[PDB]
Design a protein around this ligand. Sequence first.
Ligand SMILES: CC(=O)N[C@@H](CCCNC(=O)CP(=O)(O)O)C(=O)O
Ligand SMILES: CC(=O)N[C@@H](CCCNC(=O)CP(=O)(O)O)C(=O)O
Ligand SMILES: CC(=O)N[C@@H](CCCNC(=O)CP(=O)(O)O)C(=O)O
Lengths: 332, 332, 332
Amino acid sequence: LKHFLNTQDWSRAELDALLTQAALFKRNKLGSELKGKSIALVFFNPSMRTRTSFELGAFQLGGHAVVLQPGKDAWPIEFNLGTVMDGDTEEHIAEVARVLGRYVDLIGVRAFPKFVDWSKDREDQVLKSFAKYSPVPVINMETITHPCQELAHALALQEHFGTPDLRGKKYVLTWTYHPKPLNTAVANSALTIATRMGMDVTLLCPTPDYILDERYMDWAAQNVAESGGSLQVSHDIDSAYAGADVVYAKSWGALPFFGNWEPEKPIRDQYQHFIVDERKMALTNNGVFSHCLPLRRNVAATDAVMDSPNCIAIDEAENRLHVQKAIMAALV
Amino acid sequence: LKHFLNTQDWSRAELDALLTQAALFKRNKLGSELKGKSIALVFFNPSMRTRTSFELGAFQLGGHAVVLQPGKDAWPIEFNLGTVMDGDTEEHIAEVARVLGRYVDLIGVRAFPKFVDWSKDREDQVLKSFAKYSPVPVINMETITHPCQELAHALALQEHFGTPDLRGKKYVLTWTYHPKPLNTAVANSALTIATRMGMDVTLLCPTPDYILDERYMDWAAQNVAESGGSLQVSHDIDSAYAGADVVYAKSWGALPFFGNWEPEKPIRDQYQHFIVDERKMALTNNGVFSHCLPLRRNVAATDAVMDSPNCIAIDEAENRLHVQKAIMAALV
Amino acid sequence: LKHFLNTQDWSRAELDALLTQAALFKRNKLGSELKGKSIALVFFNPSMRTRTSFELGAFQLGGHAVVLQPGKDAWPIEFNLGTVMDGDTEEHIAEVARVLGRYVDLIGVRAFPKFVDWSKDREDQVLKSFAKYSPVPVINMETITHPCQELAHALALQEHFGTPDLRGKKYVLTWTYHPKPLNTAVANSALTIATRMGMDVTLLCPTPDYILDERYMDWAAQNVAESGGSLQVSHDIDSAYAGADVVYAKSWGALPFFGNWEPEKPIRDQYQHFIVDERKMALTNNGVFSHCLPLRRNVAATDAVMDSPNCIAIDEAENRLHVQKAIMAALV
Ligand SMILES: CC(=O)N[C@@H](CCCNC(=O)CP(=O)(O)O)C(=O)O
Ligand SMILES: CC(=O)N[C@@H](CCCNC(=O)CP(=O)(O)O)C(=O)O
Ligand SMILES: CC(=O)N[C@@H](CCCNC(=O)CP(=O)(O)O)C(=O)O
């Protein structure tokens, strides 16, 4: 059974086919690829674009999406095995996935880390549990990686440069400020797809404490070796932005501080100058800027950068709809 | 780009066309006016009829509605410009409206005042922000005015009297009791459409403190001069109801008490006799009674009045479905 | 007007027709029985299967389901008559049911007891109020009985044994452990349908305090006399399971303790050995096990029993979809 858990699990040819089908759907939005079919969209965290784009995508392809929010409308779910369920959780994923598998044709799941222990969050227990117990394809709607974002992002870049071949472009994945410590998912994914695409990638962040999990630094290293791009870590803003073709920002909490955020607060707070502004974007080679959204203006990026013609964030957001339809069609 | 923010923005001919299309849809509910199209229904406050009627209306016309609740499922939204978003809001309406504009064909928004400062609430910031940043038509699902209610109400009256011409009827918009200070939206709209329809309107309320915002008293004055009706304010129950053809009740908080509700409580509490009962309705010319709903029985109106054959509230509620379909069809 | 409030209200022939149509729909899922029609699914409590199956069922039959959650999105509702609504509730069911009746073709409602007073909960006020004021058919999505579950359960048993005739099988409805006192609805319904099907039913529970409401013990007694089965109450595990053909477990709070749960806690806690495990299932005649779900593993039933090939809970859950489509089709 094929699932869409990570682009890293798919061959380059398969990913190219997806992006091309995405472009095709963007030109002809209505179809019958999901006629009479359905997808269960399970959300354990907030969402506006993911929920909306999947729901509409199912509709446009003749199917129907059922939105569920365990703990809100649906019952809270247990993922640990062999435990005595006498706590808050009402039922086990074993039953949940099998039941939904008797109803829908696809299952999407969004589940951010709990931020108490990275050793546990990095295991990707929720997504893996769904893939294990579900008799139907599972789609990652963002857990510790965000593959749907990767493809929406990739497509937006290919459209902007007018070519599927991004090899040679200088890509800067930069950490940016946010009052709270957030998920590394988007950064992990950006690093993954940018290298898989063969670009010259620089991970820019305040300190070594903000370097991404080794798993992704390794995926990237492997992708570079296979695509022909390059990877490097930098803590210097001016040199990183220098001559960049693409700048993608996202804020995330330092991994070593999971379960202990009080001390990383004063740290991130002394780096709010990492905000993407006009000055930094001026150091780029007329590069484009993007963000996965939601974005806090004048914190993560200034109003000027957001409203600049070089910002393609709205296009990337739109592409979530198109690439996801390509994914659902491929899995059904 | 044309939006449906207020009936006051539309010409009488356009409004008549809407009401007529509403009557047409009421006779033939299924259509293809929205085939393959979608509408995002953004709710910042509770709703049963508005959510249900729009959702079903989209379905019956071949489209699909996506229901969003910022702060609940979707992310909380910032509307102020140039602010540093380091608070509760996650993203700006600038991005939200542009993103949704890449997904849906129409955007509906419901956002009641915050009740802390009428100077801010009366600016209609949320609705205006959506209309400004959205590349697609925006529909007011109730902010400080409730135009969809206006048309459902108007249609119900025309059906009841068997004619589109309501000129000459005595219309009584009366404040009624409620334990809490509420939105003036429905009253502002009733005053607006009743005068635009050319009826003899009397705004009945406990004290001068409950008179509606000047903006609407002026719209009404202008509508009367153009339609041939009349407008007057009254604090005397018996004389207001006398010979009335239509009685529309709604409770709202006194505008001068915004941000300071503790003192207006003992005030409204000494006027719970404004409740619409049989005695008052007996002073009318066999007039009809209606309310936008939700209605608290034996507080806003007695059981007898609600169950009287002269109450058309259920018909008005039904008409929300029909007039809204006419609105969506016109804007698409 | 015909509603689906309880299987007890329907003749055996009608119930057989429903189950057969359910089997038919299971073979041919897509249809036009609800083309252009809609159903309002009103939930006053959590749900995953009921919400999902009804929503998808409406879709597969060409209709649309509108999901409402009073107090969450829709306004809170009052059910008592003649009361002065100056409390938490915003509107009365009288208006709610009549309004929805102008929008949808069917209304489903889920409302668990409040657990404060069984004298009030057993009156089934919410379901009865909807049936009284609604101009369209009402479907019980679980209140104090769960008829939709009954049919999904019955169908699953008929499929398992390969025959519609279950007369002669030993059916064991057993109470099982749960940290909290729950609704008796599922047990009341299991007792009702198992006897209506003519099986030899044994209600197994810790003490006389856990015997179901007389209303259902009487329905069962009447069903046995008409179907040819049998009914008996037992507080002895080993003898009850002995030679059983079917074992259905559910935990519920002792009725005499409504409004006073502190003391029934130490009681249920001394009976956690009622958990369905391999030992007990070994005493059965290679019997099947099922549960309505959600189920807490290693509390209500062990992992081994849940994963045993004799567990048909997933099949029963799937059947909720099929029997409900048969119900909606019959009522429309
Ligand atoms: C602030 C916050 O927690 N952010 C998330 C955004 C994920 C990417 N964003 C999306 O997928 C867009 P939507 O579907 O509207 O959430 C994160 O940090 O990973
Ligand atoms: C109590 C309360 O806050 N009332 C709102 C009702 C608005 C009109 N009512 C509607 O549009 C009906 P629905 O879509 O079900 O809300 C107000 O006072 O403005
Ligand atoms: C723990 C709890 O409160 N349980 C409910 C389950 C009802 C039957 N279960 C269903 O109908 C399945 P779903 O639609 O997913 O709820 C009860 O005790 O009655």
